[PDB]
Ligand binder design. Structure first.
Ligand SMILES: *[C@H]1O[C@H](CO)[C@H](O)[C@H](O)[C@H]1NC(C)=O
Length: 7
């Protein structure tokens, strides 16, 4: 878990 708000 090392993702971020994809926008
Ligand atoms: C990052 O986003 C991804 C999208 O699938 C997952 O939700 C993941 O759990 C996220 N990581 C954190 C640290 O929130």
């Amino acid at each position: 878990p090392t993702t971020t708000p994809l926008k």
